[PDB]
Amino acid sequence: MQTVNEMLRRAATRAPDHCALAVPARGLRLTHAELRARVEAVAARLHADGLRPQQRVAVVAPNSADVVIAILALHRLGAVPALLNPRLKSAELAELIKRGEMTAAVIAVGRQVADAIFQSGSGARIIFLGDLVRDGEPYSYGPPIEDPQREPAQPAFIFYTSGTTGLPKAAIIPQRAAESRVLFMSTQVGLRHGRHNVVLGLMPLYHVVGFFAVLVAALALDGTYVVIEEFRPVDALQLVQQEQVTSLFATPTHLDALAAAAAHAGSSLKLDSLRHVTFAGATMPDAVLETVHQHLPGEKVNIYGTTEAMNSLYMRQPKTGTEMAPGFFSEVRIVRIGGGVDEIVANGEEGELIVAASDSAFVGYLNQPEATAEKLQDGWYRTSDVAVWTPEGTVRILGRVDDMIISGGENIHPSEIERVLGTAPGVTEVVVIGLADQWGQSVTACVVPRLGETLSADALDTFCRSSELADFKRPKRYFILDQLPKNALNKVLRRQLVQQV
Numbered sequence: 250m251q252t253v254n255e256m257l258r259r260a261a262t263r264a265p266d267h268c269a270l271a272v273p274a275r276g277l278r279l280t281h282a283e284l285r286a287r288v289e290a291v292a293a294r295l296h297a298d299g300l301r302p303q304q305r306v307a308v309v310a311p312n313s314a315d316v317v318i319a320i321l322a323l324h325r326l327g328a329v330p331a332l333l334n335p336r337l338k339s340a341e342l343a344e345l346i347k348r349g350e351m352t353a354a355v356i357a358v359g360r361q362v363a364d365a366i367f368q369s370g371s372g373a374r375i376i377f378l379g380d381l382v383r384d385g386e387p388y389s390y391g392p393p394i395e396d397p398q399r400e401p402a403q404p405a406f407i408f409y410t411s412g413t414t415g416l417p418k419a420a421i422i423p424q425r426a427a428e429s430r431v432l433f434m435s436t437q438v439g440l441r442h443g444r445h446n447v448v449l450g451l452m453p454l455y456h457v458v459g460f461f462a463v464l465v466a467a468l469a470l471d472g473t474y475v476v477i478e479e480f481r482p483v484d485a486l487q488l489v490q491q492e493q494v495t496s497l498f499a500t501p502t503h504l505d506a507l508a509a510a511a512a513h514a515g516s517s518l519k520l521d522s523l524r525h526v527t528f529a530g531a532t533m534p535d536a537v538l539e540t541v542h543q544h545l546p547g548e549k550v551n552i553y554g555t556t557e558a559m560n561s562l563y564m565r566q567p568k569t570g571t572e573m574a575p576g577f578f579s580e581v582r583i584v585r586i587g588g589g590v591d592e593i594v595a596n597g598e599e600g601e602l603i604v605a606a607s608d609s610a611f612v613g614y615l616n617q618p619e620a621t622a623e624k625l626q627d628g629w630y631r632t633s634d635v636a637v638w639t640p641e642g643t644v645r646i647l648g649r650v651d652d653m654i655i656s657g658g659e660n661i662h663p664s665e666i667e668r669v670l671g672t673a674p675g676v677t678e679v680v681v682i683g684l685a686d687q688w689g690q691s692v693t694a695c696v697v698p699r700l701g702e703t704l705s706a707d708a709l710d711t712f713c714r715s716s717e718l719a720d721f722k723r724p725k726r727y728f729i730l731d732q733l734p735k736n737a738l739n740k741v742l743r744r745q746l747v748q749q750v
């Protein structure tokens with residue numbers, strides 16, 4: 250295997266004086282050799298203060314060069330970094346760190362978090378990021394330390410992933426997973442080894458794409474990672490131009506923003522250097538996709554992936570955001586909902602997408618053996634997504650099993666109806682739910698008007714009748730709301746909505 254550490258180490262022997270980290274706004278640049286020096290120095294410092302291999306360290310910070318240095322230093326030492334979304338409420342962060350039995354916590358968020366950690370009773374030692382490394386410059390004492398022995402199945406990193414109503418679960422990523430979590434960027438997306446690589450770090454580092462597929466890949470291929478501390482669509486495009494960015498990996502929401510800024514900019518922004526525009530994470534509307542093809546350069550690639558197994562499907566120059574096919578490393582099937590991994594459907598029938606659990610796969614959720622046994626079954630990872638094989642030999646993603654509505658013997662996927670209701674005049678936001686009906690469930694739309702506008706059930710039903718929706722799919726009730734209840738990561742508390750209505 251090559252661990253994260255070993256991929257970056259080899260890269261540094263190959264391209265020591267090439268730029269590894271660029272932070273344009275701050276005028277900071279570090280070569281592969283310089284980044285290595287600082288990784289080693291922060292590692293030694295942590296080891297002198299008593300941090301040891303296989304111990305877990307929570308990391309809670311926005312993207313920055315300093316956090317890259319810190320995360321890589323923890324790994325270099327042998328400790329297991331547990332990367333956490335900084336938008337999580339203090340209390341949820343304090344509880345996850347606690348449940349994880351973590352030796353320490355590296356944070357670059359408020360005093361309020363720091364309190365909440367201390368005030369929770371977990372033994373985790375609080376480390377402020379700017380106390381470890383500041384603007385690429387470490388506070389250094391001790392140097393240097395032993396490169397610890399790493400084993401294929403051994404835990405390497407922990408990433409968090411939301412469940413059928415949280416808290417987020419701690420997915421344990423083993424040492425052997427790193428290589429294939431990088432190399433799909435080459436086999437599926439077509440990135441290749443070389444100092445030509447300038448990768449815009451738009452994805453957050455607490456997400457497996459932000460870290461393996463963007464940061465680690467950028468470096469492991471002897472390229473440059475461009476740090477983005479806060480997403481700004483025009484600024485980001487200026488960086489593409491200034492830095493000669495070759496690839497960018499973003500969410501449907503980033504790309505919608507970028508496509509529009511690019512449309513407005515025209516030939517004012519030179520985007521020639523950009524060869525790869527990759528997206529994953531959500532199912533992108535057709536309208537967003539179309540503007541992507543229209544106003545952004547480079548090859549477009551849709552990537553289906555999970556925290557648990559990384560990349561399982563993809564599509565080059567996609568026409569819809571729903572249809573993708575397995576690539577290298579991957580093996581997939583669609584099986585009856587709630588059935589065995591060998592219960593294959595008559596393709597064209599709907600079932601659960603499951604993918605083989607091989608080298609890229611997590612080894613389990615930390616301290617949740619029951620959730621693990623639901624997800625990892627007989628060599629397979631179960632995605633909890635509903636899918637169908639198209640007559641074209643592709644996998645159409647339909648929606649979450651958990652979101653699926655069962656109304657009079659039929660699967661009804663809210664995402665499909667939300668897609669249609671989204672295009673109705675005056676609708677700013679819509680979530681579609683099943684309300685308990687003693688037939689099984691009744692399809693219900695919850696709709697928010699655009700600022701100052703009015704909506705009506707009559708008008709929205711008419712609109713649905715004029716749509717391509719199958720009759721049985723049209724909502725039976727509408728609720729016009731001024732807000733949908735959401736968590737701190739702004740996703741709909743669908744169960745709590747059901748309650749609210």
Ligand SMILES: Nc1ncnc2c1ncn2[C@@H]1O[C@H](COP(=O)(O)OC(=O)c2ccc(Cl)cc2)[C@@H](O)[C@H]1O
Binds near residue numbers: 458553555560561646
């Ligand atoms: N291109 C895509 N289209 C539709 N759904 C997609 C998608 N990529 C991921 N998803 C779904 O979003 C969920 C978001 O889960 P998360 O745990 O937030 O992580 C990801 O998005 C993700 C995407 C790609 C890779 Cl290689 C690794 C991780 C995921 O579990 C899938 O069920």
